[PDB]
């Protein structure tokens, strides 16, 4: 059996929504002196049902009252966020590899109806090898006439596949320039940029950077790119892509960019 008894806890890895995630090692079992990552609700099958190279392998599950635990694998990569702030900027190369693994994940999801909405460089890990796994799955959607009814509406705008792609974009915009693409003096300035959406790109990108962030950073979902029945494969065709070989990338072959120590 597995209890909580069977972990013990070297160190908090972070507090999250309602949420802690501790570092912990077994103590009991077959993998005792395994090192994984526990984390904890005060009162799953989404984890369960997805085994991908850049989503987080989940290994046990258990319920007591009033408490769940997930136990799932150590990634020692950490944020890339850290990554980032290290440097200030990636280069596109780099950039690229990152976001390419991350449209394999976003794409496996979508098949599986997952939706993650958001995508901060603080929600994308690493792994030993370096390599990007995807984390968090809290705040994630789980997707008469109508000829005088809304286009919102008609696209199940705000619940649909889109908004991931978007969120690669502003992703995409931050590693580049090394800032969001709209940012506010406040919460509710910063809202009312990203709504008016005005975007602008810095001279230095490449026309492959501009031409992508354009497609995916625009505020009609509907003609974003990746909004299609492609989905993640409209993304991938594009022209910042080319050099990917995606079976390679699939293997986790391609030497990551930055390797942990
Ligand atoms: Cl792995
Ligand atoms: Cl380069
Ligand atoms: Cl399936
Ligand atoms: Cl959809
Ligand atoms: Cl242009
Ligand atoms: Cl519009």
């Given at each position: 059996?597995?209890?909580?008894e069977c972990?013990?806890?070297?160190?908090?890895?972070?507090?999250?929504?309602?949420?802690?995630?501790?570092?912990?090692?077994?103590?009991?079992?077959?993998?005792?002196?395994?090192?994984?990552?526990?984390?904890?609700?005060?009162?799953?099958?989404?984890?369960?049902?997805?085994?991908?190279?850049?989503?987080?392998?989940?290994?046990?599950?258990?319920?007591?009252?009033?408490?769940?635990?997930?136990?799932?694998?150590?990634?020692?990569?950490?944020?890339?966020?850290?990554?980032?702030?290290?440097?200030?900027?990636?280069?596109?190369?780099?950039?690229?590899?990152?976001?390419?693994?991350?449209?394999?994940?976003?794409?496996?999801?979508?098949?599986?109806?997952?939706?993650?909405?958001?995508?901060?460089?603080?929600?994308?890990?690493?792994?030993?090898?370096?390599?990007?796994?995807?984390?968090?799955?809290?705040?994630?959607?789980?997707?008469?006439?109508?000829?005088?009814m809304a286009?919102?509406?008609?696209?199940?705008?705000?619940?649909?596949?889109?908004?991931?792609?978007?969120?690669?974009?502003?992703?995409?915009?931050?590693?580049?320039?090394?800032?969001?693409?709209?940012?506010?003096?406040?919460?509710?300035?910063?809202?009312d940029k990203?709504?008016?959406?005005?975007?602008?790109?810095?001279?230095?990108?490449?026309?492959?950077?501009?031409?992508?962030?354009?497609?995916?950073?625009?505020?009609?979902?509907?003609?974003?790119?990746?909004?299609?029945?492609?989905?993640?494969?409209?993304?991938?065709?594009?022209?910042?892509?080319?050099?990917?070989?995606?079976?390679?990338?699939?293997?986790?072959?391609?030497?990551?960019?930055?390797?942990?120590?």
């Open positions: 059996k597995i209890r909580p972990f013990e806890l070297l160190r908090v890895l972070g507090k999250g929504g309602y949420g802690k995630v501790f570092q912990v090692r077994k103590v009991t079992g077959a993998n005792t002196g395994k090192i994984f990552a526990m984390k904890v609700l005060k009162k799953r099958n989404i984890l369960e049902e997805v085994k991908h190279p850049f989503i987080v392998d989940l290994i046990y599950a258990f319920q007591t009252g009033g408490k769940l635990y997930l136990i799932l694998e150590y990634l020692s990569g950490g944020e890339l966020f850290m990554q980032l702030e290290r440097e200030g900027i990636f280069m596109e190369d780099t950039a690229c590899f990152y976001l390419a693994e991350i449209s394999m994940a976003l794409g496996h999801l979508h098949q599986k109806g997952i939706i993650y909405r958001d995508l901060k460089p603080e929600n994308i890990m690493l792994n030993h090898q370096g390599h990007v796994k995807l984390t968090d799955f809290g705040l994630c959607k789980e997707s008469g006439t109508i000829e005088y286009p919102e509406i008609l696209m199940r705008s705000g619940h649909n596949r889109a908004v991931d792609w978007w969120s690669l974009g502003a992703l995409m915009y931050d590693m580049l320039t090394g800032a969001p693409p709209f940012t506010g003096e406040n919460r509710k300035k910063t809202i990203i709504l008016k959406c005005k975007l602008n790109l810095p001279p230095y990108l490449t026309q492959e950077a501009r031409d992508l962030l354009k497609k995916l950073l625009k505020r009609n979902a509907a003609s974003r790119l990746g909004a299609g029945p492609g989905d993640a494969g409209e993304v991938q065709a594009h022209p910042f892509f080319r050099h990917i070989n995606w079976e390679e990338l699939l293997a986790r072959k391609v030497e990551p960019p930055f390797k942990p120590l």
